[PDB]
Paper text:
The tripartite motif ([name]) proteins form one of the largest subfamilies of RING-type E3 ubiquitin ligases, comprising more than 80 members. [name] family members typically contain a RING domain usually catalyzing ubiquitin transfer; one or two B-box domains mediating protein–protein interactions; and a large coiled-coil domain region, which is involved in self-association or oligomerization with other [name] E3-ligase proteins. All characterized family members shared the same overall [name] twisted β-sandwich fold consisting of a 7-stranded and a 6-stranded antiparallel β-sheet.
For example, we observed a unique 11-residue deletion between β-strands 2 and 3 in the phylogenetically more closely related family members [name] and TRIM67. In [name], this methionine, Met608, packs against Tyr619 on β-strand 6. The equivalent interacting residues in TRIM67 exemplifying this loop collapse are Met680 and Tyr691. In summary, our structural data provide a platform for future drug discovery efforts but, importantly, also hint at significant challenges in developing potent small-molecule binders targeting the canonical binding site, especially in cases of particularly shallow surfaces and those partly or largely occluded by either loop collapse ([name]/67) or dimerization (TRIM36).
Numbering used by the authors: 533 to 704
Write the structure that this text describes.
């Protein structure tokens, strides 16, 4: 297929991660944010996938992005130097990498929201979407090497992974 179909990798997950629904749905047992990765790694081309927010209780900062296979699994994505992510609450997002917060953007998530992640190895960049609108500027501009889709979240969030998608501009 022109699109990639994948699920989360149970072998990538922190022990507190709960995978369900053919490894397409994830939550966590802990108040602490924990990581899971996609099973398919990307190193070239352009790839888009989405997360649907099934549950968003209280005001946590789940994170979405890409990571190396050896990213820290027990902390928010982007606390270490092996993930590039957007974290977002009900109000606003930030981008994070190496414990550096950048490009705060107004607008957040709620139950039913969609988060899109556009990983572009030809432009070496990473762009985020919320509800089919670009969230902030291009987040990062030195994308290279092998990356896996990545999520971090805690017990206040559940998300479902949607793959088999083309790039956001594919139609119309």
């Amino acid at each position: 297929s022109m699109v990639a179909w994948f699920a989360f990798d149970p072998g990538s997950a922190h022990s507190d991660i709960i995978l369900s629904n053919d490894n397409l749905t994830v939550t966590c047992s802990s108040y602490d944010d924990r990581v899971v990765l996609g099973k398919t790694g990307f190193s070239k081309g352009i790839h888009y996938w989405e997360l649907t927010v099934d549950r968003y209780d209280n005001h946590p900062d789940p994170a979405f992005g890409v990571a190396r296979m050896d990213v820290m699994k027990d902390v928010m994505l982007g606390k270490d130097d092996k993930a590039w992510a957007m974290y977002v609450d009900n109000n606003r997002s930030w981008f994070m990498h190496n414990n550096s917060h950048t490009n705060r953007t107004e607008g957040g998530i709620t139950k039913g929201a969609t988060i899109g992640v556009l990983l572009d190895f030809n432009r070496k960049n990473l762009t985020f979407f919320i509800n089919d609108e670009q969230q902030g500027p291009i987040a990062f501009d030195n994308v290279e090497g092998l990356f896996f889709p990545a999520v971090s979240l805690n017990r206040n969030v559940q998300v479902t992974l949607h793959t088999g998608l083309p790039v956001p501009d594919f139609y119309s």
